[PDB]
Structure formats: structure tokens, C-alpha cells
């Protein structure tokens, strides 16, 4: 009924930003943590009225956390491995949330730990989120766990790892990745659908979602299908090429490499399902009920891809 105060961290991140724009808009007050006030998104999040920001790091900074949850009734938590150790950060946040005593629904964005389901290793940027999940549960916090499908907007023609839609010379697009060409993967349109879905989960309350795991994915397409989406949505010819190893064409950080190497082994070498949890082995069902105004790969490709590229510095579309 009444709009509540929501606490969020990593405000500039795609999941949070989505929620913040939507939540602020409908009337909720937002208390968010950002690493830096510098940046487009940051300044934007600053331009939205009922949004309060706290600039500071998350690691070993329990004071930021205490302030963040003051007067908070709801919270959506999605940490990054970059801010430092996710498990310790993810546990401090949970402790703060409980110490605030006002949290009615605590949504944490979790990810599988593949080694728990096969000789597969643990995807570093994913595995720890499962430990934090268990700890959230351990504290007794009324919670719900969301598992995000791969972002639609990870795609770009720029030489960024794993999801490059490189613009070949012959006026076509090729996409190099480890993922099996015929294996359906879980996708998610971060900007367009994370916000509304989260809102619906909050509107439902823990009386419905407490203890549940929700696969935040609204459509599952195989690499070939994803390319068929782009190719049928831009007049261009798009092909998928399965490569045993991920291509790093730009000086990236350590963490991000190891992460990619794990991916190569898990999906390229073991053809292991994105969501190895049994409950996730249709998966998109719960999501589409939570929010039916979802944006699939075709709309994303025909309506957004061309725009993001342009503002990104490309005229291939013009």
C-alpha cells in the first residue's frame, strides 16, 4: 500500500539504477550507496528528487551501512566483487540490516556456485553470492533471492570481453563466445525489467516471497537464437562462432580475467547450465508473472542496441 523507504548499494550498477529510477518515480524514498558522485548515472541518480546518496566504500565500512538502513523498510542488495571481498561485505550489510530492525523485506541478488553441482569450478564473481545468501537466511531476515539472467545490454561492438558484437568489414556482425551454440541461456534486460520486477516482489511482500529464489530472467535464447534476434532486427547478417577461449582485447582487471577463465571451463568445456540449481533445471515463468512488460532480445536489438552504439561513438547505423 504505502510507499516505503528502500536501501540499495552500488546505485550506478544496472540492477540498482533500474530499481531506483522506477521506485523513486512511483513515490518510494531511496537511500543508496555509491562509490563516487562523479559520473553520468551518479549525477542522474542525484537529479532524482526522493533519492539520498551516501558516497563511500562498502568494505570494512559498517558506519555507511548503519546510516544506509536508517528508517529503511525495504532493501535490494547487489554487491560487486570489485568493491572487495563480497562475502564479508555481503555479511556486514546483512548485519546492519538486522541491527536496524526495520527491514520487512530484504532482497539479495544471488548467484550459483557451480562446484556444488559438478566437477565444475566456482565462478569467482558468482560463487560467494551463495554464501552471503545462506548468511542472510541465517540471520532470519525476511528475504527473497533473485538470480539475474545475462544482461541484454552486455552486447556492444566495442572490444569488450565475452559479449562483443564486433562489426566485421563486410558490414556484418559476428559474436565470439564459449557458450554452446545450441544451448539456451537465461537473458535479462537490466534497465527495462529489473526495476519493475523488484517492485512487484516488494509489493507482494515476504508473506509471499520470503525464503524464495527467483530466476530473474524473462526469456531463454541460445547463442544462435540471440544472433537470429539481431540479424532479424537490424537488416544485417549476424553469426555466432563458438570459441574455446574468451577474447580479451583490452587491459582489464585481474578479477575480471579469472572470472572469464572460469566461464570458459564451465560453459565452454563442461557445457554446464547457467543456473545449475535443480529448481532452475519453465524457468522464466515466475519472472513473467511478476512483470509481463518485459523487453525481449528482438526489441532490445532493434530499439536499444542501435542507440547505445551511437551515443557510444559509432555511426554504423546512420
Amino acid at each position: 500500500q504505502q510507499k516505503k523507504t528502500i536501501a540499495v548499494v552500488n546505485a550506478t550498477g544496472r540492477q540498482a539504477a533500474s530499481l531506483i529510477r522506477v521506485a523513486a518515480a512511483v513515490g518510494h524514498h531511496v537511500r543508496a550507496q555509491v562509490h563516487s558522485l562523479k559520473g553520468l548515472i551518479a549525477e542522474e541518480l542525484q537529479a532524482i528528487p526522493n533519492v539520498t546518496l551516501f558516497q563511500g566504500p562498502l568494505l570494512n565500512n559498517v558506519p555507511l551501512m548503519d546510516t544506509l538502513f536508517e528508517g529503511a523498510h525495504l532493501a535490494f542488495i547487489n554487491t560487486t566483487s570489485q568493491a572487495g571481498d563480497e562475502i564479508a561485505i555481503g555479511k556486514d550489510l546483512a548485519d546492519a540490516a538486522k541491527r536496524a530492525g526495520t527491514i520487512q523485506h530484504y532482497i539479495y541478488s544471488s548467484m550459483p556456485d557451480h562446484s556444488l553441482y559438478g566437477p565444475w569450478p566456482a565462478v569467482p564473481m558468482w560463487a560467494p553470492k551463495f554464501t552471503v545468501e545462506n548468511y542472510v537466511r541465517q540471520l532470519g531476515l525476511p528475504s527473497t533471492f533473485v538470480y539475474a539472467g545475462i544482461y541484454n545490454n552486455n552486447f556492444t561492438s566495442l572490444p569488450y570481453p565475452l559479449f562483443q558484437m564486433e562489426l566485421m568489414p563486410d558490414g556484418t556482425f559476428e559474436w565470439h563466445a564459449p557458450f554452446d551454440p545450441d544451448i539456451p541461456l537465461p537473458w535479462l534486460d537490466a534497465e527495462h525489467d529489473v526495476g519493475p520486477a523488484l517492485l512487484q516482489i516488494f509489493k507482494d511482500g515476504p508473506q509471499k516471497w520470503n525464503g524464495h529464489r527467483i530466476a530473474l530472467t524473462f526469456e531463454t535464447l541460445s547463442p544462435v537464437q540471440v544472433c537470429a534476434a539481431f540479424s532479424r532486427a537490424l537488416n544485417r547478417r549476424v553469426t555466432y562462432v563458438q570459441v574455446p577461449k574468451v577474447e580479451i582485447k583490452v587491459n582489464i582487471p585481474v578479477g575480471y580475467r579469472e572470472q572469464l577463465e572460469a566461464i570458459e571451463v564451465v560453459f565452454g568445456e563442461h557445457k554446464a547450465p547457467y543456473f545449475p540449481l535443480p529448481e532452475f533445471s519453465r524457468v522464466t515463468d515466475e519472472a513473467r508473472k511478476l512483470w509481463s512488460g518485459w523487453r525481449d532480445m528482438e526489441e532490445y536489438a532493434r530499439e536499444v542496441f542501435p542507440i547505445e552504439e551511437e551515443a557510444n561513438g559509432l555511426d554504423w547505423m546512420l
Binding site: 529510477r21 518515480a25 519493475p196 512487484q200 512488460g293
Partner: protein
């Protein structure tokens, strides 16, 4: 046709504003549930 809000031209179902103007399934559905127009980036 196009969406008055998001300008998309691709959507599973078109909807109309309480006046009659075209909105996409999402924008139309969002407003209907929360009461305000679906906010966008930038």
C-alpha cells in the same frame, strides 16, 4: 505506430493512455499498476 512514452515501435501488445494515445505493453502496464509513467534513462 509508436509509443508516446518510450517511442518503441516493437512490443507484444499496444495499449492506450486514458485519452487514446498509443503506449507499448510495458509503459501502459507500468502506469496501470503504479500510477505514474514509466521513467527512462538519461
Amino acid at each position: 505506430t509508436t509509443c508516446t512514452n518510450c517511442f518503441t515501435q516493437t512490443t507484444p501488445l499496444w495499449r492506450r493512455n486514458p485519452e487514446g494515445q498509443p503506449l507499448c505493453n510495458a509503459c501502459g502496464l507500468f502506469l496501470k499498476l503504479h500510477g505514474v509513467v514509466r521513467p527512462l534513462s538519461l
